[PDB]
Ligand SMILES: NC(=O)c1ccc[n+]([C@@H]2O[C@H](COP(=O)([O-])OP(=O)(O)OC[C@H]3O[C@@H](n4cnc5c(N)ncnc54)[C@H](OP(=O)(O)O)[C@@H]3O)[C@@H](O)[C@H]2O)c1
C-alpha cells in the first residue's frame with residue numbers, strides 16, 4: 462500500500478492483480494471507473510484519475526506514449542511522486558523517437574522522478590507467472606531512492622530486479638524484447 | 642446468466658473476466674470466497690460452493706479431475722443442470738484414464754448433462770479476448786439443448802463453437818492441443 466496505477470487496459474489490470482496478490486493496496490485511475498471497475502480485481506479500488514494519484518507514492522503509468530500528455534492536468538497532484546514507465550515500444554516507435562518513452566515522461570512531469578521498469582514482462586506473466594523469483598526485471602532511473610522502492614516492489618511481486626543504471630539507459634532497456 | 646463457475650484458479654478467474662466483459666452475470670463457487678474474491682473481477686459474485694451452484698443453469702467446472710469427486714456434496718443442488726468440463730489433461734492423464742474427464746464427470750453427476758468445451762483455449766486468450774482466427778472452440782455433449790446453451794455463450798464471448806458430436810467425442814477433444822498466441 463498504497464500503489465497507484467493510471468490506466469484501465471490489460472497491463473493495468475494484470476499489474477493490479479499481481480500487486481493485490483503480493484499484499485499491496487492498489488488504487489487505479491481510469492477515465493471511466495464505473496465501466497473499468499467491473500473487470501478489475503475486487504481488492505483494487507478503481508476510481509477517477511484525479512482521485513487515484515493523490516494518495517500513492519508510486520504510480521505505474523500503464524497507458525501508451527501517445528496518451529502521456531493527456532495526463533498533464535494531474536501535474537499538481539503528481540508533484541514529487543515516483544512514476545513507473547512500463548511501456549514496451551514497437552521497433553518502429555523506438556527508432557522514430559530520439560528519447561526513450563521514460564525520458565519523454567520525465568520531461569512532461571519534471572517535479573516527478575521516473576523509473577523504467579516492467580517493459581519486458583508480459584501481462585500474462587504478471588497475472589499468472591510463478592513467484593519463483595527467477596524472472597528478471599531491468600530497472601533504471603536517476604534517483605536511487607525511487608529505484609529501490611520499485612526494486613523492493615518487484616521483489617515482493619516475485620521478480621528479480623536488475624539495476625541498469627540512470628534513466629539514460631531507458632532507451633536501451635526499451636529495446637529489450639518482451640518475454641515471451 | 643447467471644452463469645456459474647466452480648473453482649478459484651487462473652482459469653476460473655479468466656473465464657469470469659471474460660463472461661462479465663460479454664454481459665453475463667457471474668457467480669463463483671470457492672471453498673474460501675473471502676480470500677478468492679480479492680483477485681476476481683468485481684462484477685463477479687464470489688461465494689461458497691453451495692450458494693454458487695444454486696442459481697445458475699450452466700456451471701463451468703474449473704477444477705482439476707482429481708477434485709471432481711470433492712464436489713459430490715453439491716449433487717442435490719446441481720440436479721438437472723448443465724456442467725461444462727473445461728479440463729485440458731496432460732498427455733499422461735489422457736492416456737492413463739480409459740474415459741475422458743467429461744465422461745468421468747458425467748458419471749459422478751448422472752442427473753446433470755455434461756458439455757465438453759473450452760479445453761483448447763488458454764486462460765490468457767480468455768482474458769485478452771479471442772481474435773481471429775483463434776476463435777474455434779470444440780464442443781461436444783449428448784444433449785442438443787445443453788450444447789446450444791454453451792455454444793451461444795461461446796459466441797457471445799467472441800469464440801466460434803465447432804460441434805464435435807456426442808460426449809463420446811470428448812476423449813478425442815481432450816487430446817487437442819491447447820492454443821496460445
Ligand atoms: N500487455 C502487455 O503484455 C504489455 C507488456 C509490457 C508493457 N505493456 C505496456 O503497458 C501500457 C498499456 O498497455 P495495455 O496492453 O494495457 O494497453 P490497453 O489494453 O489498450 O490499455 C491502454 C490504457 O490506456 C488508458 N488511457 C489513459 N488515457 C487514455 C487516453 N487519453 N486515450 C486512450 N487510452 C487512455 C486507458 O484507460 P482509461 O480509459 O480508463 O483511462 C486504457 O486502459 C503500454 O505502454 C504497453 O507497452 C504492455
Ligand SMILES: NC(=O)c1ccc[n+]([C@@H]2O[C@H](COP(=O)([O-])OP(=O)(O)OC[C@H]3O[C@@H](n4cnc5c(N)ncnc54)[C@H](OP(=O)(O)O)[C@@H]3O)[C@@H](O)[C@H]2O)c1
Nearest residue numbers: 648649650651652653671672703704705708728729763764
Ligand atoms: N489455465 C489455462 O490456460 C487452462 C486452459 C484450459 C483449461 N484449463 C482447465 O481449467 C481447470 C483449472 O485450471 P486452473 O489453471 O484454473 O487451475 P488452478 O489455478 O490450480 O485452479 C484449480 C481450482 O480448483 C478449485 N478446487 C475446488 N476444489 C478443490 C480441491 N478440493 N482441491 C484443490 N482445488 C480445488 C480451487 O478453487 P477453490 O479453492 O476456491 O475451491 C482451485 O483454484 C483444469 O481442469 C484445467 O485443465 C486451464
